[PDB]
């Protein structure tokens, strides 16, 4: 019965403000505090502050004072958090959670989280380059090959090998955000040497935000 539904992912320009929402249901909105938390990868969880809908209103962590402003609408049972003057430091997943109530408390209900990315980058399909194996011999050696999916924005990209028939020995790494402001990822796979001449390995790349679809054959050479 108790559920917190948060608003969708947001992609914002640096300097802008964004308002994220938390719609609560299955309980009396006014007597429970709503907590806000930030998670940037590599910075664990951070408490931003909390707000009590209708009453005693707010408590902010001195650090986010000025960056975050909480409000809550009682008729629609929705709590809001506004982040202003956004910077890359604000790119993170933001969660709302239901805390304590005057009369009852027995843990928390957490929202599903809202991803906010702050970048001045423009939408862009990646270039897919081959990572060619070097081996071609000895009755079944072991070679690695792959694809470099370079310079796309925004996330994410999806990668499969031979339309999905090869999944064994496949590692598609986490994307990395480059200085250029674009992302890059590699997908690699190790196969038996013996096949390098016989078998074909194509990596299938899809970047929906730019409607880019690429099938890249990767051959020894």
């Amino acid at each position: 019965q108790v559920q917190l539904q948060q608003s969708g992912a947001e992609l914002m320009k640096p300097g802008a403000s964004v308002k994220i929402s938390c719609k609560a249901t299955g309980y009396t909105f006014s007597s429970y505090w709503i907590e806000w938390v930030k998670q940037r990868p590599g910075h664990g969880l951070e408490w931003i502050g909390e707000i009590l809908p209708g009453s005693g209103s707010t408590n902010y962590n001195e650090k986010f004072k000025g960056k975050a402003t909480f409000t809550a609408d009682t008729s629609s049972n929705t709590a809001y958090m506004q982040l202003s003057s956004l910077t890359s430091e604000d790119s993170a997943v933001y969660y709302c959670a239901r805390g304590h109530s005057y009369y009852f408390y027995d843990g928390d209900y957490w929202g599903q989280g809202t991803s906010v990315t702050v970048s001045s980058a423009s939408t862009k399909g990646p270039s897919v380059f081959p990572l060619a194996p070097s081996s071609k011999s000895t009755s079944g050696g072991t070679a690695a090959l792959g694809c470099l999916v370079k310079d796309y924005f925004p996330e994410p990209v999806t990668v499969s090998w031979n339309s999905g028939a090869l999944t064994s020995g496949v590692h598609t790494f986490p994307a990395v955000l480059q200085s250029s402001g674009l992302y890059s990822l590699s997908s690699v796979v190790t196969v038996p040497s013996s096949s390098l001449g016989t078998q074909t390995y194509i990596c299938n790349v899809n970047h929906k935000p730019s409607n880019t679809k690429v099938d890249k054959k990767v051959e020894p050479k």
């Binding site: 380059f129 081959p130 990572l131 060619a132 690695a144 792959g146 470099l148 370079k150 690699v188």
Partner: peptide, 25 residues
């Protein structure tokens, strides 16, 4: 790890950039 190194492809070089990859598997 088993280690592999990959030179940039001719495809990328035309583009003017070079990525050299090292894999620890």
């Amino acid at each position: 790890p088993s280690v592999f190194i990959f030179p940039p492809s001719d495809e990328q070089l035309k583009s003017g950039t070079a990525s050299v990859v090292c894999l620890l598997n």
